[PDB]
Amino acid sequence: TPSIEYGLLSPMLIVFGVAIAGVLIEALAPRQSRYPLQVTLALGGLIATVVAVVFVARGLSGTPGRPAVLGAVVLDAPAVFLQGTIALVGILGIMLIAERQKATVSAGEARGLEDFTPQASAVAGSVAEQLATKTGVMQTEVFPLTMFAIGGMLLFPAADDLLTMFVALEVLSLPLYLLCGLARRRRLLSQEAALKYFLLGAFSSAFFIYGAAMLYGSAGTLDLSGIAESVAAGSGNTSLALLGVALLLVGVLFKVGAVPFHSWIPDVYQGAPTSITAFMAAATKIAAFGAMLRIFYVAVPALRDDWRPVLWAIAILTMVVGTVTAVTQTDVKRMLAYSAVAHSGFILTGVIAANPAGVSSTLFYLFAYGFSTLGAFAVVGLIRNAAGDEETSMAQWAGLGRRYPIVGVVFSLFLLAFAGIPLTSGFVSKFAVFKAAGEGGAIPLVIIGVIASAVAAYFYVRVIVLMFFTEPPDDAPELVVPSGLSTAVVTVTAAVTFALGALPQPLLDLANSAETFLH
Template identity: 40%
Template sequence: MDYISDLQAFLPGIITAVAGLVVITIEALKSGSKSVFGITAVALVAALFFAILDLGNPVTEAFSGMLVHGGAVAFGSIIILVGTLFCVFLSNDYLEDIGHNYSEVYALVLFATSGMLCLAGANDLVSLFLGLETMSICLYVLAGLMKNEKEGAEGALKYFLLGAFSTGFLLYGSALLYGATGTTSLTGIGAAASGDLLFVAGAALLLIGFLFKVSAVPFHMWTPDVYQATPTTLTAYFATSSKAATFIAMILVLSRALPAVEGLDWQAVLSVVAIITMIFGNIIALVQDNIKRMLAYSSIAHAGYALVGLASGSIEGYSAVSFYLFAYTLMNVGAFGVIAYYERNKGLDFSDVNNLAGLGFKKPLMGVLLSLFLFSLAGIPPFVGFVGKYYVFAAAINAGMIPLAIIGVLASAASVYYYLRVMVYLYFREAHQEVELFDPSMLTKGALVILAILTVYYGIEPVLPTGGLMDMLTSF
């Protein structure tokens, strides 16, 4: 029956949503239950398993065309779930240490993930808005988790106000597109696309809403404050899974609803935004002493690299962006995870790069892992970050956008400075004072080591077991 196949199509999202309800119920019956973490992890592993099973299927519609699943869309779901799973693994000990290991956090993460999965498979403006808002509302609450601290309250309020404002743009753009085409289906909008002012205005407002969610300049204002104020492991979740969901949704919108129309050049618009975003993000990151703010501006720059692939307007470019999101998730969650470990050691503010001086030899494994993730973020071979950037810039070159690719390469080269700066403090600066670092738990250590192995493996052999990754991502 159709409804059974529909449920199977969105099974990962259903699993995470039901798990969120179970977590809330358990918390209501027995506050502070230790089983909440296990339920969350098992639910995410199960959702990931079904998403992997769906990877080999062609992209097909479900729920009367409201959602799509399979193929490249399933790969987007895998990215979201991988990022979420490792963030949850790293969060358990970290949130316990800072006194914020509430069951509600895991429920919000599960509900947000369900929204992300809906957003990444949205084939209609209604389902797109539903997924976006489910994700966003949960993230607003998570951003304010440390509400008793000034930075936490300020970051959450800024995120909420600007997020609500950007959602208004997206919703108003959707209304204009519906008025111009008479449908909310992405494929229907693409079939009725025109150069009319109503259609152009609607598409522009829709893209503005997306650009805010991915922290593209000039819609990035919330990013550094929110990243700094949010617990570090949850910051990794904001920076990876939510961004991956939004980019996959952008790919679906651009490929299905906004085809090339006479008088409209979305590629040129995205190219300009990509250039501004790459340059601004890297320049501001160069002068940051706070590592979380540095990674926040770095994430803005990485959004610019992904926009380069979108600007190519080709299947190759969209495939490259998908792989880049996968690469970015592995190395960014890893980097934030190591920083979270350092922050758990009391006595100094380890989010300040100056206080990392001399710590590289204190716990050699953690120092090596952080260096590996930073090398990958900088795009240095043989790590996965290099392969991701290669695919994105190659897609731009093949689309005839050679100047855009050159600017991207130069911006990426500039980023090497602030990534290597962290390693200089770790290994080549004297410690300000004697600091004793505790041994990380097996869960934290294991999660980080697995992320490091994946970062190296997919840098050397960028394929999945079932075949070439770039061959699999052939249709949106």
């Protein structure tokens, strides 16, 4: 019989079982009790996942990783590190998702402070939507779907086979496609975002599977270890291998947001629910870059001389176009999305390093940046126009910091982390990736990313200018708490973003210990 390492799969199994249990709650639980259970089932579940991870991590203190399901899944140090990062980010994202309306005379608060329309199938602004809002109904199906996303995402770094990694890509993509279209406010934009994300993601996934086919043809094996053995031994075709690497790179780059594939990120981040947008921008990037790391440092290191240049052309672009485009942006959400494109480029610079320092720097970069992005988007979700819609217009943020100094300082901290100012986790993060690139002979990327960061500092700083140095307008937006969960998310995220800047050696030792994959 096939040996199954349940202990190693423990975090993944916990997450997927919790998702299935949440679907059961949706099925056979009364409406009034669905939300208390789901969130309780969800957050606790993720907490268990985190616990599982550390246990697995401790188990990995011996063998340098080990396959779990007869290949097709490998939990080595990078895999467990990324899984723990994704688990923490998912906990925070679900706490953001579970936020309900602050308070009202009627008890019909409907998970709206998290931007989720009470009835997604209901037409925007229709009498049915208004009645659903009044009755306080909520589609708790969000919590299962989100868990599934996390599930697939937890798998995506750990997938040691092309088939499993493709399945994980689809499993994480579909729930996100659905979630993009559930926004409570600006429903038309959210539905457009869902459609765009679905179309481009399906297109990219077709490319990903075609590349997997090409790699399988070249190497005659789907395990990444087998592909590496074949390409190194020269047994493969060596042209199908390169073509498959390119096509698979297309899919992963789309998932992370390289410039040739970035265009979806701005629209999707602007249109998707703010909580979903935050959780996405952090954890999906983490998972996609984990898979990319596995592909390049395990599956196909031998062809470094072949794919190294291509990534250069992308990384440069991702640093340039991602930043230069953000310069003229006037929407906070859109500006942050372009910032995410640029930070994908910065990650790719470390990935290009092709050295263990590259792996460690990328892992730390992903952790710190995922936290910073989650916090920034969570904060953005609180700036509410008079009508209640998120005042994403940057001009409307003028004097926001003066009205709300604490939230303003927190958002400025996140912005400076993105800009990579020292004493912020962002600087340690950028320094790690650029140092890894320099040690890897890619110091021209260090220079170009330095210039790109200088450019991006402008649009990171303009927000602070509006927020603090400008007098508030007459119709300036107002904060909405809206509950303890959102404040906890924001404070935890800011605390991490500051601690990893001041005192990064913690978790940097962890990143260093996870600089080696189970080749």
